[PDB]
């Protein structure tokens, strides 16, 4: 429920040592959190928004050129000049042209020639700034229980339902607690400051399309910039990039509009992340978040309930997800009131000996006395199995078989952790929970190593990485000492591996 087949879901089993589980939320996935008690909650990140903006530089593209003045001087009568140069809207260059009797005036030789063109702009990027305040992350809390086929649909009363809650955290007021009536109240101490290393990222608007770029990228662009003064002749600095002054072989000098560079900037943006606008809110759809998580105040709401009488019927074909659970949707006719769901995962008709790990802890119907619909999510064992309900004559039993074995799931979790280290490394170690001198020291060593890695390997494209990785993997078989070859081979393997995990 809000984490169903999203294919980037990560569920953590157990929070042991003080009901304190830290989690790395991101927009690309979701996290299912479960324990021995305290029912299974799906925690997400949905919309990173930024409210107020600050205008850093503006870059023109489509320049319109007129009035094109020009003035020449006899070869020793000084530098060229024209009144239009005092206007500072106009672009000026001074070339040396010939001059003779057949040119006009002079002795003979080479004299200066300036040509000047009006510069006016039509398309420009606004180039707004992001500061690490001013933002709100929206987190959707979703509890597995009395809910059926949800995941979006009717969110205003679904927020009013006890199964869901929206949590708008912000660095003004982090560390928020959401009420889930009957389930308890879930607390969370998120760190919105250290999310994506903002204030290095500028928000960037072309026409209706919007990116997040680096400031070390955005300063270095050779286009005419504006600045921040929002006054008349926006005085475009540069204005020399977007024009080009081309003369003849010796004589007359003409100006050249270099034309709309909008698609060239699109091809230069190969590496930014998209975003959107809502009025003034820059909605970012990417990004992650570290968050401690207080599962202190959770009740199960259904400990002191009865077990439902009969008419179990499940309706929609139990539906295996990506690796995940079996998600069975059931329907209870003939029930009396808020009674529990008996459900389990048994190998056969031998003591029914349940070996499942159902993840929907304590499933509960509402009342309806009628067709009420539940979701159930069960891990089955990797051999043959039966999803079993245990209560009733011809209760309802369904057969099940998996795909893959335990070591396959071990390798699959290994490559999930590999992608967890590839994106967002230096906080992948805070996806798992409580660490004393193991996870904290691993995070610290990965912090030093990743800081040195980012410091000496920045400006690393995909193909750059592959080249340098193959070069260092060749040097790993080279000269001597078994140590510097091992450092070189390990570093080249890290480079090739971080190249593969991004694109694949």
């Amino acid at each position, epitope marked *: 429920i809000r984490c169903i087949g999203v294919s980037n879901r990560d569920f953590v089993e157990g929070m042991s040592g003080g009901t304190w589980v830290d989690v790395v939320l991101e927009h690309g996935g979701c996290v299912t959190v479960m324990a021995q008690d305290k029912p299974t909650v799906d925690i997400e990140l949905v919309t990173t928004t930024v409210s*107020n*903006m600050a205008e850093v530089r503006s870059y023109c593209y489509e320049a319109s050129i007129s009035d094109m003045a020009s003035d020449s001087r006899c070869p020793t009568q000084g530098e060229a000049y024209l009144d239009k140069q005092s206007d500072t809207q106009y672009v000026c260059k001074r070339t040396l042209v010939d001059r003779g009797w057949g040119n006009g005036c002079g002795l003979f030789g080479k004299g200066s020639l300036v040509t000047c063109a009006k510069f006016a702009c039509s398309k420009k990027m606004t180039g707004k700034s992001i500061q690490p305040e001013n933002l709100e992350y929206r987190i959707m809390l979703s509890v597995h229980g009395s809910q059926h086929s949800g995941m979006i649909v009717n969110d205003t009363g679904h927020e009013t339902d006890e199964n869901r809650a929206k949590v708008e955290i912000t660095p003004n007021s982090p560390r928020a607690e959401a009420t889930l009536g009957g389930f308890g109240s879930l607390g969370l101490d998120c760190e919105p400051r250290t999310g994506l290393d903002f204030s290095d990222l500028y928000y960037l608007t072309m026409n209706n399309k919007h990116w997040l770029v680096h400031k070390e990228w955005f300063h270095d662009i050779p286009l005419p910039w504006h600045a921040g*003064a*929002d*006054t*008349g*002749t926006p005085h475009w600095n540069n204005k020399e990039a977007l024009v080009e002054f081309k003369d003849a072989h010796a004589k007359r000098q003409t100006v050249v509009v270099l034309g709309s560079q909008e698609g060239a900037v699109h091809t230069a943006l190969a590496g930014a992340l998209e975003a959107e606008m809502d*009025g*003034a809110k820059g909605r970012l759809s990417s990004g992650h978040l570290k968050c401690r998580l207080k599962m202190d105040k959770l009740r199960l709401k259904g400990v002191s309930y009865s077990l439902c009488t009969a008419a179990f019927t499940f309706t929609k074909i139990p539906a295996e997800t990506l690796h995940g659970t079996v998600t069975v949707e059931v329907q209870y006719a003939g029930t009396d009131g808020p009674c529990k769901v008996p459900a389990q995962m048994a190998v056969d008709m031998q003591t029914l000996t349940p070996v499942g790990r159902l993840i929907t802890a304590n499933p509960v119907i509402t009342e309806s006395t009628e067709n009420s619909k539940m979701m159930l999510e069960l891990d089955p064992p990797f051999g043959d199995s039966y999803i079993v309900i245990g209560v009733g004559e011809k209760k309802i039993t369904h057969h099940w078989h998996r795909s893959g074995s335990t070591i396959g799931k071990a390798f699959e979790a290994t490559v999930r952790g590999a992608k967890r280290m590839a994106v967002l490394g230096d906080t992948a170690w805070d996806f798992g929970s409580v660490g004393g001198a193991l996870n904290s020291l691993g995070k610290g060593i990965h912090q030093i190593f990743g800081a040195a890695f980012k410091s000496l390997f920045g400006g690393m494209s995909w193909f750059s990485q592959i080249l340098i990785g193959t070069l260092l993997m060749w040097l790993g078989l080279n000269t001597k000492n078994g140590s510097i070859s091992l450092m070189c081979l390990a570093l080249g393997g890290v480079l090739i591996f971080l190249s593969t995990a991004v694109s694949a």
Partner: antibody
Amino acid sequence: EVQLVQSGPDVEKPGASVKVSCKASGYTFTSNYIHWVRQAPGQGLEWMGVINPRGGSTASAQKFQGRITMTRDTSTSTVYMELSSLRSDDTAVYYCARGGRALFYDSYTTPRDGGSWWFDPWGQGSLVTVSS
Amino acid sequence: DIQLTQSPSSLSASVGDRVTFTCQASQDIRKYLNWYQQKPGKAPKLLIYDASNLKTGVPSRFSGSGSGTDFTFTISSLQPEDVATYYCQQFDDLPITFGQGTRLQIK
């Protein structure tokens, strides 16, 4: 007392430029941003722009960039707004009032406001009529 | 450039009435709104800074409130010297927008 006093009404031709003065009294002249606000007779208020009397920096609205220029005079404690490229839409009444937390320059958005955000100083206003 | 709608357009009431004005911005201006009354062609009378605060010298019959984007101005007792045109003003992001206005008439 704390008061901004403006020049008299002006009648200008279309395509010309008008200049409206705004002289201060009763407070330190380099401590309060002077905001210029227009008002058409058949319309409400509309913010033209802002000058800092310290350092003479300007900013203004999108409907007037390139058309408005704001200068200062620290000696006579006066603020000049020159509106160029006049049209028949510019026949209005022009206002100029403070707004504090005017320590360095520009605007000062997220720091504090209010207490004559720009309410008090306004005085008599300046009717500007653009016709032939 | 935040659009600041002021409701209603104009009103009329007798002396001693309570009246309320609504200003709604299209975006979040959380407490950055203030309120003017302007007598026609004159130096005005002061109502509200920071959407909830009176200034010294203002009579206490005026009040303002509002938290998210909706803001309510309130005159407790209308008086014959309170006929004016009533404006509300955004503070945020600086294309500083005023409301259209609210006129009153003495019954």
